[PDB]
Structure formats: C-alpha cells, structure tokens
Amino acid sequence: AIKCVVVGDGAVGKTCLLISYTTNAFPYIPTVFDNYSANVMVDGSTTLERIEKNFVITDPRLPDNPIIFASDSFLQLTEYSREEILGRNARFLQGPETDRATVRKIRDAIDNQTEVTVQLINYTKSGKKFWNLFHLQPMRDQKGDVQYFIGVQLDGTEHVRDAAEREGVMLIKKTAENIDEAAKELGSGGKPVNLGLWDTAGLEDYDRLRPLSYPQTDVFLICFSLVSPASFENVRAKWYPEVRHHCPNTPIILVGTKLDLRDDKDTIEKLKEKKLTPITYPQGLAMAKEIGAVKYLECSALTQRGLKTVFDEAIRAVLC
Numbered sequence: 001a002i003k004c005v006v007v008g009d010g011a012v013g014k015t016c017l018l019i020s021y022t023t024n025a026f027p028y029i030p031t032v033f034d035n036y037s038a039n040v041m042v043d044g045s046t047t048l049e050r051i052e053k054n055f056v057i058t059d060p061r062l063p064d065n066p067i068i069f070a071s072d073s074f075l076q077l078t079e080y081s082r083e084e085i086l087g088r089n090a091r092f093l094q095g096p097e098t099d100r101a102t103v104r105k106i107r108d109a110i111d112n113q114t115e116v117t118v119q120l121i122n123y124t125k126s127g128k129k130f131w132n133l134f135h136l137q138p139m140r141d142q143k144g145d146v147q148y149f150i151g152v153q154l155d156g157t158e159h160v161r162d163a164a165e166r167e168g169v170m171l172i173k174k175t176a177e178n179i180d181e182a183a184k185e186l187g188s189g190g191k192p193v194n195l196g197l198w199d200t201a202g203l204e205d206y207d208r209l210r211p212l213s214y215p216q217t218d219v220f221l222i223c224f225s226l227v228s229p230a231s232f233e234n235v236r237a238k239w240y241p242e243v244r245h246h247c248p249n250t251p252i253i254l255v256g257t258k259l260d261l262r263d264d265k266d267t268i269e270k271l272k273e274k275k276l277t278p279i280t281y282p283q284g285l286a287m288a289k290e291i292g293a294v295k296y297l298e299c300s301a302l303t304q305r306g307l308k309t310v311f312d313e314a315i316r317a318v319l320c
C-alpha cells in the first residue's frame, strides 16, 4: 500500500490526470479533496532488482551461455558497466592466477546442469584481484527443464576455511533461493500494489487544510501546467517549500501536465497575446534538478501520453 499525494496550482490538471489514469475518462470542478485507489501490477514495466547482492543470471539455451541479467552490486564489484557485460559469458572475470582446475568443475556443473560451490580468483575490469566464493544453481521451468542459471558471488580477500567457509556457503545458498523465487515471481507478473491517490486543492483558500493529508506520504507529485508559466514558477515559490516544510525527505516527482497543448496553435496564440511561451523540456528539467526531484515527467491527461509512466515512476521511487 503506497500513498501518493498530488499537489499543484489550480486548474493545472491534477484531478484530470488521476481520473484519466483510474477510469480512462476525462472531465471543471475545483476539487476540495478526493480519494482514489487503483490496483497497479508491478511487472518491470521489481523484487529482483531490489536484491542487493553480487549475482548474475545467464541463458544456457543461448550460445556460450550469455549473461541476461546483472545486479547493481555485481557491477560495482567487477567495475564493469551493464552494456559491457550484458550478453557475454562471465569468463572475463578469470585471469592468470585463476585455478583452471576449479573452472573445469564449474564447466562440468553447467554441462550436467547441477549445482556447484567453489572458491576461485577473479579480476575486476581494472585488474583488481579478489577471491570469489561462487555458487551456481540452475533454474528449471514447470516442465522440469533448465531455463536459466543463477550465479552468486561472495567477494573476499583470502580463501575462507572451516567456519568462515561454512558461513559463506550458507549465505550464498540462501541468497540464490531468494533470487530464484524473485525470478519466478517476475514471470508470474509480480504482486499487485495498492496505490493510494490523494487529490488536493490548488486554490490559496485551501492552503490551511491541505497539509492535513501530508502525513504518511510515500511520494509527492508536484504538478504544473506546461502552458502556464505562472504554475511553473509556483513550484519553486510555493509547492516545493511547502512539501519540504512538512516532509523533509519524501521523494518528489515533478510533473508537467497538458503536454498536448504545447504543440497547439490556439493555445500558443493565447500565450503570445500575453507575451508568454509554453514551458520547454529543459526548462522543466532544470526545475526538477533545482528542487531535487527524482524524476521529471511530462504527460497529457487527454491523450494519456506519458500518463502511465508518471505513476510507474511514483511507485519506483518508493520501492527504490
């Protein structure tokens, strides 16, 4: 259950983006307060990415058994970027002092599709030497055929022995099972996440009752209108200081609404008569970086363009 509070000036599209996202419709009635709760399915569009351990996943059905997934932790350890290793066999980690007889035991485990737990010397991208308490585990489908391979690494400085060895093997095995369950859950479509949408009033008259819905907030949506420079300036002048006055460390996502009007003839003409111009993307991006927003997203409640990405990043900011 995630609570999401949407704040911003009057008539910028706060209520419309909530209704269009929950009921696929489109309404002007100044909202005092309204609740909205919709079930969102997190399908990586995950719990597998939240696992902060050194592990990778490969595909034995593809030539040379390439890496199809690599954790953030694995990237920080091996000093490799994702694009550099995604799709390549994990043998690049090996080097001169790497015991080849141990590598053979790994090869036999993959060929026979079994589990294996070994210790070997691997190398980072810059050539940093470290011991690897490595555990390999095949991931079978519902039929019983091996679909993937899980490789869990426990980096160290020396070759662990006795109790230290027994402790480490225990950890990487328990870790592998967690990954295995996280992978199966991903294929099933993950778990449904209840999203609480709290619509607030933008009028100045409701400035006193508005912070009453701020407690227990997991993520804020500060909205402004792309065709209203006044609402854009209010983000720095009003909405950001107000949110931070009650919620000092709550994830804020800046949202530019009414995207379909930025490329509208009559709309731009209306703004030119008042000597104004629609808010541009770098302008909106500079505002998000200034107020420390985790993401800047533009959307249209009317055409639903970028509308789903807004609430997807809202959830992602909470789960990550």
Ligand SMILES: Nc1nc2c(ncn2[C@@H]2O[C@H](COP(=O)(O)OP(=O)(O)OP(=O)(O)O)[C@@H](O)[C@H]2O)c(=O)[nH]1
Pocket: 008, 009, 010, 011, 012, 013, 014, 015, 016, 017, 027, 028, 029, 030, 031, 200, 201, 202, 203, 257, 258, 259, 260, 261, 299, 300, 301, 302, 303
């Ligand atoms: N073309 C276009 N118009 C929009 C869009 N979203 C909102 N509008 C218009 O802007 C007006 C603002 O709608 P609301 O969502 O009710 O305004 P609000 O942000 O909720 O402001 P408050 O009700 O005071 O809190 C609506 O009457 C729509 O006509 C959009 O995505 N595209």
Ligand SMILES: Cc1cc2nc3c(=O)[nH]c(=O)nc-3n(C[C@H](O)[C@H](O)[C@H](O)COP(=O)(O)O)c2cc1C
Pocket: 056, 057, 058, 065, 089, 090, 091, 093, 094, 103, 106, 107, 110, 120, 122, 132, 134, 136, 149, 150, 151, 152, 153
């Ligand atoms: C999922 C998975 C993860 C692996 N992780 C490592 C690793 O971290 N370090 C390493 O030296 N080898 C790792 N290996 C083994 C190598 O990718 C490779 O299979 C092994 O070196 C044998 O290669 P070869 O058959 O060409 O001799 C992993 C293998 C798999 C399937």
Ligand SMILES: [Ca+2]
Pocket: 143, 144, 145
């Ligand atoms: Ca079979």
Ligand SMILES: [Ca+2]
Pocket: 205
């Ligand atoms: Ca008044």
Ligand SMILES: [Mg+2]
Pocket: 014, 015, 029, 030, 031, 032, 199, 200, 201
């Ligand atoms: Mg409203």
